[PDB]
Amino acid sequence: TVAVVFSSSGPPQAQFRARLTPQSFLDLPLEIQPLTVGVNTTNPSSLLTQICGLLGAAHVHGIVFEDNVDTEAVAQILDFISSQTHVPILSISGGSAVVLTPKEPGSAFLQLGVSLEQQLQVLFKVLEEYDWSAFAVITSLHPGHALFLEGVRAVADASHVSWRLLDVVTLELGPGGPRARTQRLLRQLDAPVFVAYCSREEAEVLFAEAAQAGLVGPGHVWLVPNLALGSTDAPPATFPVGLISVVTESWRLSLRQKVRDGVAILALGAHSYWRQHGTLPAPAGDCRVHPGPVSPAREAFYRHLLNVTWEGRDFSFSPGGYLVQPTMVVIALNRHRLWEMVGRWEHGVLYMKYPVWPRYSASLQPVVDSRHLTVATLEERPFVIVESPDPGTGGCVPNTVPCRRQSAPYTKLCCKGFCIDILKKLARVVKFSYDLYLVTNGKHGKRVRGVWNGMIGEVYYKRADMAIGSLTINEERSEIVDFSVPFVETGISVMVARTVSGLSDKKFQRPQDQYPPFRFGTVPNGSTERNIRSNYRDMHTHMVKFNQRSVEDALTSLKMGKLDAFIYDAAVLNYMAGKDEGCKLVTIGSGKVFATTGYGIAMQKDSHWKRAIDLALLQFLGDGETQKLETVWLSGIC
């Protein structure tokens, strides 16, 4: 048998009947007969008398609690009762589901919640991803403030980033006290990120005071644990929009649904113990007698009661009465005063709905940071390399940047390469922030009747602000999108198998050879095939039967013997001939470069960045760091 108790809400007579009705709900192998009890008011004698009477006149094996208006100092009574009469109980919701760390020795409470350590871990896993590192910690004079202050420091030393702390302050945010002193202390602060710990009344007082002393505008960000924010279904006034909290799963289920989970976990625990010994332990419910030394049978049943799994939800209780390894979900206050999901957490890796933090204003109209820009690119093997994050610690190796392939759902890869290092140094010197995302359409750029795809398309239509990578310079692009000075020098080159004297040779100029027809490369839809077609019609006509899949399959075709000559860029062709199986070489060499242009950073027309960072590129080229990067990333054997 399993008991059920309600408290302090709209009278759930219909809910009580609906809970009592499924005497066989088929939610587990075997179903003990459920019974329901309801207390009118929450009080010490009321609760004590009801539970003692029910469990002494019913002979019950387990009992499931349901919470109330969320007042404190109620879980202690449950701990006391469970320790005395040795009956396992379980709290499911409200204020009684707040973790009690030093529980009684022989008690079996098992309240589903999360300790401050796990919540702080999740919060610092969302601070690291957006890279704030401000740490303005504010705590009121609360009973548990010392534990929070110890935990934040303990976790601060358990990560990679320095986490430069700025200030921690403790103030009397109670119903009665000097408001002027707290006003003075709040008026003197400077940090873009705040972490606060207090109670709901303390939260409302502190937020009202912060609104008075101008700390709630679009400049700062606030974070609170689940202890504050109260009901979750009625956000009061003076609560800043953009508040971030972390709550466990099932923050939107029904009261009836929660009880169904509570009875299921007890039923599986008995069933799991049933397979071991084929019995259900007898109840021990003499509240009046209050007997019982340490009992091994109930101890073994409780030990087997810890781990449970059903319906694809892992409930694993630590020795302390709180569950370990849950799947928390981060929530935030939308622009219309309504809690909404922002980012999940599942086996230690954090996700987010937004690649950047939306910042709102007093009259909404989401402001955009002036010193932040979006950069488009894609993968070119010598220059941009994409690697999936390692299963090591969630985030990938340092000296790499997060980078996501846009297409709502996203997978966070992290891109590496030469142009990435250039971008990192540019961000270091010009003092700006950025986010990087790969392109999905055609590689580099084309004009199919005014529709430009690729990075040039994403920049020309004002969906991006730069476009770094392997992006050469030509007459067409330079008309519609700006450009900066070249930093890597390329052209057109031919790779052969280790026979021609340039493009003007009759081998390529006159495709009228009888026995041997020569074969070309020309991976289409790129820069080179535009110039080649525009300047030599016959070659374009005769180049239809040319292998065109990538810069990878062309090497295989050349090594096989199905193709004779490759035409492509120079900076990638000569590098590709540096590290090769054997030694495949090109024509005469750097003397054979045709239409010698250079790589560049595209920009929206008339952008104020252009002048600022062209000088930085020139400075970087002047003193020779580019030579070091080239010798690190662009060296070969043969």
Partner: peptide, 16 residues
Amino acid sequence: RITGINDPRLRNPSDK
């Protein structure tokens, strides 16, 4: 030739 500064056989991993 396995140098100490950087070998392309070492800088770029090979199969053998």
